[PDB]
Design a protein around this ligand. Structure first.
Ligand code: 9MF
Ligand code: 9MF
Ligand code: 9MF
Ligand code: 9MF
Ligand code: 9MF
Ligand code: 9MF
Ligand code: 9MF
Ligand code: 9MF
Lengths: 251, 251, 251, 251
């Protein structure tokens, strides 16, 4: 009874460790559970709906603690699949990795919390969401694509900042006394930031003909130069996928 | 008198079934008719304009029922073009497909409705709009492009969610008591969602210097990381078109 | 004295007709003049600043009429450069083209107007702006790129429309009586259109927990599926430039 | 003691002049210092927080003056690294370049200012931010990419302007008397500009059924044709990076 043993250990370590396919289904389900916990906590932040929120949240938190403990133990057991971590010493030295210790300390802290502390619960929940990666692949990919396109990101940032400063100063000059919205340069800078991002709250906006005339040009330039970085990064990601796919199809 | 018979049957089945060219003109016209029906229903949802809207909608609904019935019958007849569905048995077994039964049940239901029920009319109208595809090609193309770029979509979603949570929490801390807009963490989360998408209703916005200072950075990051997915998918679609066009030109 | 004659005629026809380089400077200057005329008319639409607006606009309109007449006559004269239009008969038959007759009728109409009619001035000014192309190249390029990417434009439009309808209906159901903003389905549709485009006026927005909860998902999907078409078309234009540049460098 | 001399001079000139790698760390730190100075000035523009703002700003301005003077002198000394600028005459003729004279005059002016003048401080601070490039590389790259994609930028601008004019005029006609927001054509143009950019202040918006019906189409077209330029430029930048990277990898 060792062929089935090794088969199961291999498959379980592969699914729980770096997955590639349908193994993501389990990760999606556990993510959905933790997300439901987070949403219930957010609902518990209110007074009207506090009752039902805590009623569900208590049992859901117990369930997620049970699930996380079981997952951690099965991961520790299946760690013997890799040729490096073998035996008692191998599994003992496996735990020294940052993420395993993070997991064990996290479940210890949350079990202590559950057994005015909701702030700690929020912190631990967002930290668990941070833990979802477990390998920093997202950060590495983002850093690679950002470094590849550093020159254009820098030029876009430079020109956008210059346009923001110029537009804010000109509008502040043109509407110093005729509009109470722009009473200090800080207010004009806030207006420029909120308009060149196209958020447009509406709390501030030019009213004199000078301000509207100057905006009709400077906002037209600034909106594009503020949307540029997202387009650059999206095209970078798409081109990287294209090149990777063609290269992998070659070999 | 069978060469013309087969010619007409072939051409009509090709036009009514998968079209490639000017056949889309008829589809566009029928879509325009159903869209006019939908708009008239929306106008009939109001009390001031109920009279004229209903007066037009009755006859337009009758016309569209007639058109859909004629189209269904001619499609059933022309189904004999394909080598698979032939004869009485072939045409009888043709109707078992999901979309043909959907069409027949749909026109039956709408004719029954026309012969406080406007909710059913709305449901059936949006269902007809769903039926416009008839092959799920849109869904398949979207799924293919999404699967191809899954890694970058995931990284963008992860970083955007983290930025949203961090910004909302920091602003909520900075404006707990000095601004009545942010009285619960749910309100801060709503503000963050509405600002990082650049919708910017204006119902909530920071007013203290802390909130504005923290936004000036976190919204700058979050707006880009929330615009990223659309750019990624658009570039994916464009690159897919380029590769498909070059490949088809090769052969 | 015929080498200089032909040299000047060739150069002037090339600059005035399809330009390629610094010839665009003259076009830019004339565009700036007509744009100034338009802006002065817009200022004349107001009562406070009517005086100075008309004072400048009268002389500017006279100047632009003079310039347009001179340009039309010199174009007619230089039309003899092309091997097709030659001599009296050639130049007479040249005028039959749609744009030349448009220009002559336009300057006739504007000279008649200048010699409560400001509406006609606005119409003729926007028409002159339309005339700026003179070849429909913009429309042809747009049509080509749109036709190339028709399938993805259609899928994006389909999914975006479905998302808009679903989100609007769900929010209307969730906020029929608890929010006076959503009192008819037309209002909910207007809100959905204004939110999925990220315009976000703020005149309408959900207030109940149901509406906010449903928006937190449906707007996240819809904003991306509404931004998709612009990204698709921009990537199409960029890829077309890349391919054209490489092809021209090949030959 | 001349091998170390030349080694240090070479390394310092390379780091202070065109950098390529970790040399950017020093530039980032000096940028952070000047940015802190700017933010403190902006805070000093207010009356409530003037005290602490000026208290920090005085010493920070002294520190930045010291740093800039030291940097200028060390740059002048290290200029001897280049084979062109050598000796007393070489270093003397080095200063004639626009940026060196700009820097020396700038530090002279700021030292004079520090030894109701805050407007001059703002001007000199934004000018120092302008000086951050020192080579105009950002402007050259932007100009190159803009020139490469000139045709599509022009077509997008043309169609977007036409759509803006048409939509504004139609909405103004449809809401001349029933909505006080649109009382002059200038107001309608302002509304169109603020809506087609998706800024959406909310100060103006259609209320009659005509205006909403016409917007539901014209804004849908205009939003895409106004977002087009940023997407075009972003894709251009990404494709330029791809081609440059492949070409450099070739050689
Ligand atoms: C102003 C501006 C942009 N920034 C700074 C910046 C970057 C990203 C941000 F998110 C915020 C601020 C910037 C601009 C330039 C030209 C350079 N180049 C340089 O100094 O080399 C001599 C550098 C090193 C930084
Ligand atoms: C254009 C413009 C403004 N800037 C530059 C800037 C910022 C702060 C300064 F103090 C000075 C210059 C800018 C713009 C965006 C969209 C982002 N976010 C982003 O790129 O996400 C990927 C950032 C990080 C900076
Ligand atoms: C937080 C976040 C994003 N999401 C979830 C998500 C995705 C799309 C949505 F639209 C909404 C939520 C996410 C993030 C990561 C790193 C992973 N990777 C992983 O767990 O493998 C170990 C997965 C499987 C999902
Ligand atoms: C960035 C960001 C936020 N997220 C990720 C997210 C969402 C919910 C969570 F609970 C957790 C993480 C996000 C953003 C967009 C634009 C979309 N829509 C889309 O991509 O359409 C193609 C989706 C589906 C998710
Ligand atoms: C709903 C939706 C989109 N539209 C219509 C549309 C297009 C552009 C607009 F700007 C507005 C409306 C649409 C959708 C599909 C699936 C098809 N395909 C089809 O019928 O072939 C069988 C067609 C022909 C049109
Ligand atoms: C997604 C979405 C909505 N739709 C589709 C749609 C429109 C009307 C219907 F009645 C039905 C379906 C849509 C979206 C945009 C941005 C545009 N404009 C554009 O693409 O400019 C290039 C158009 C022309 C249609
Ligand atoms: C209207 C419009 C766009 N513009 C002007 C413009 C450009 C950029 C701006 F930011 C602002 C205004 C424009 C349009 C066309 C067709 C041409 N072509 C031409 O005249 O050749 C005969 C030119 C030379 C300029
Ligand atoms: C589409 C549209 C409007 N236009 C064209 C236009 C402008 C003024 C006119 F008077 C006439 C035509 C437009 C749009 C944008 C985003 C920008 N900014 C930009 O591209 O940054 C890179 C500019 C410079 C012009």
């Amino acid at each position: 009874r060792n062929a089935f043993y090794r088969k199961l250990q291999n498959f379980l370590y592969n699914v729980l460790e770096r997955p590639r396919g349908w193994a993501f289904i389990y990760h999606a389900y556990v993510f959905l559970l933790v997300f439901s916990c987070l949403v219930l906590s957010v609902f518990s932040t209110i007074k009207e709906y506090e009752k039902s929120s805590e009623g569900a949240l208590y049992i859901l938190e117990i369930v997620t603690i049970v699930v996380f403990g079981v997952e951690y133990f099965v991961r520790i057991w299946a760690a013997g699949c890799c040729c490096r971590y073998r035996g008692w010493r191998g599994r003992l030295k496996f735990a020294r990795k940052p993420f395993c210790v993070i997991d064990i300390m996290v479940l210890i802290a949350s079990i202590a919390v559950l057994a005015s502390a909701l702030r700690s619960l929020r912190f631990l929940q967002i930290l668990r969401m941070i833990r979802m990666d477990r390998r920093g692949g997202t950060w590495k990919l983002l850093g690679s694509v950002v470094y590849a396109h550093s020159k254009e990101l820098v030029t876009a940032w430079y020109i956008g900042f210059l346009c923001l400063i110029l537009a804010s100063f000109l509008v502040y000059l043109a509407e110093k006394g005729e509009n109470d919205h722009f009473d200090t340069y800080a207010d004009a800078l806030w207006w420029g930031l909120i308009t060149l991002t196209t958020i447009g709250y509406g709390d501030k906006y030019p009213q004199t003909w000078n301000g509207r005339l100057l905006a009709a040009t400077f906002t037209l330039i600034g909106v594009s130069f503020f949307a540029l970085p997202a387009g650059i990064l999206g095209s970078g990601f798409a081109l990287k996928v294209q090149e990777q796919h063609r290269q992998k199809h070659f070999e």
